[PDB]
Amino acid sequence: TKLLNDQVVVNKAAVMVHQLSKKEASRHAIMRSPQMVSAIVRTMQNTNDVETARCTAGTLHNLSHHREGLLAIFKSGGIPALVKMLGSPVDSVLFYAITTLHNLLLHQEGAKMAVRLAGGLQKMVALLNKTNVKFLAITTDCLQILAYGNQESKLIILASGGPQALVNIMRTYTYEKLLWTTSRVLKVLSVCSSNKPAIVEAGGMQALGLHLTDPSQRLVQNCLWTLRNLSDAATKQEGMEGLLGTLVQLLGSDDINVVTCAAGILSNLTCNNYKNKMMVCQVGGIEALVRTVLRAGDREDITEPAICALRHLTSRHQEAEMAQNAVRLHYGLPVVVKLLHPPSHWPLIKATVGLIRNLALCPANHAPLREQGAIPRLVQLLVRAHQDTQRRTSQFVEGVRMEEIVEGCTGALHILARDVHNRIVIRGLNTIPLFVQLLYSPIENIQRVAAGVLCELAQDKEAAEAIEAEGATAPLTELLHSRNEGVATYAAAVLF
Amino acid sequence: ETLVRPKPLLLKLLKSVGAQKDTYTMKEVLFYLGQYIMTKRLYDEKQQHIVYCSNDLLGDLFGVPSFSVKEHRKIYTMIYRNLVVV
């Protein structure tokens, strides 16, 4: 070892130490040896040579596979030096440095901190631009050892452009243990929502869901529990004709944790992009979502996204009429209204009324919505949500704004008031007093549909008498300059 | 709020009433139509559901000699063609 304690002989002495550190019963006293490891380390960084820098770190890996040489390198501090040799052009060094570091991140506490302190994060991400899948698979594992259970590290992976690299690792290679470790890394970088826009903006979600045929059941789930979170940015992304076809086909897979996930994406992906909510209508998804609510039952985690997705599909695009018709040709109108009845919670009921509102856009659905007993069930919840708001002054319980149930139910009664028979039901339930009591609501969205539902009722000459006997001479008069234009248009329409 | 550009035929309807943009939230499209048919008095005072767009520019966009406002889906189809889609 006195050898080590001496730029031409370390080329020699580090060879015979490389030789002595492959036999497990002959490498017992070469790791538990003081000065020998200390003299190395520094002659690795302060080196111009190659076979010196190769054979120097060339023994560090051989010292590092027993609970002795790992501590001898750490006690002699080589873990901040080996991250300098993470930019070495010598492909030998990167396979003698990264392979070494990966061993120091298995049975070595005190290295997880010293690797982030030295600066290996911004270094190991600059290494994920290789092609040797052995290098990609090992380094990606090291990034899942430093990111798991640490928030300060996930952000260092962000600025290092780490998100986009793992997307193109998915988008290119077919080696599973690479694509699985990458999926192991891509989740923990998406559970906190400061690390998510930069993933989809690099074309992320259309690359994670690029795995539809792959019998690696611990990988497809490792891609779907990612997209369920990253959904917040696909609201504007496009070019997902190959993901939606993948997702819409999975609304019938034998597992219940994919129906929960695949539907949880389509809702938060059709939310307001005119094409994707017109794409699942071009792949025949307007049906598969129905026969998904028919499959769930009293499982709110499935129906709520399967309704919100169906709510998004039945309004405000060109191919919306078939979305309103084909939901009843597949026998939805019975089960749709039967979600309003107990024990569904406020989140689903909010989405359920919103669907029926859009479902009443088609004329042919007016009566089967009436005959299935929907008009009373709307005011049955319109009264409870309204009289709850009042007893507070003149806020989110179970996740709903409560006052959205007022706009949602009154807005759904206003569409069905187009049918003349439904007006005998809407008036025949003593709701003209209530609709007038909503014209005073300080909220803008509640006054419109309330001033609009009376206008549909007032065109019946009989029903116009009651409204004027309600004290409706100032509400629909002071609203004649409403910046929200729709309030004044209907208010004057009732007045006349 | 949904942005989409009208084809040049319809783009002249909104220009001639008070607009100047190209990307319209698909409401002003209806809005400046609600002033193009209301200002020129193109309806029928007896039954104002009907719009007489005969010898006029509006008949060149929707075809048809006349129509009804309550024919919602028929008029919406007449929108998406004088409007940029894929």
């Binding site: 309004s315 405000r316 856009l361 206003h414 569409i415 609009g452 206008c455 729709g486 248009t489 209907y490 004057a492 329409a493 006349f496 | 698909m26 409401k27 209806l30 809005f31 139509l33 609600g34 048919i37 209301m38 309806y43 039954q47 104002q48 559901h49 719009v51 406002v69 309550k70 919602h72 889906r73 008029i75 919406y76």
Partner: peptide
């Protein structure tokens, strides 16, 4: 206003 009411009601399919 009979035209104003019906046309504003046409704009209710996009809201």
């Amino acid at each position: 206003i009979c035209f104003q009411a019906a046309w504003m009601c046409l704009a209710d399919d996009w809201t």
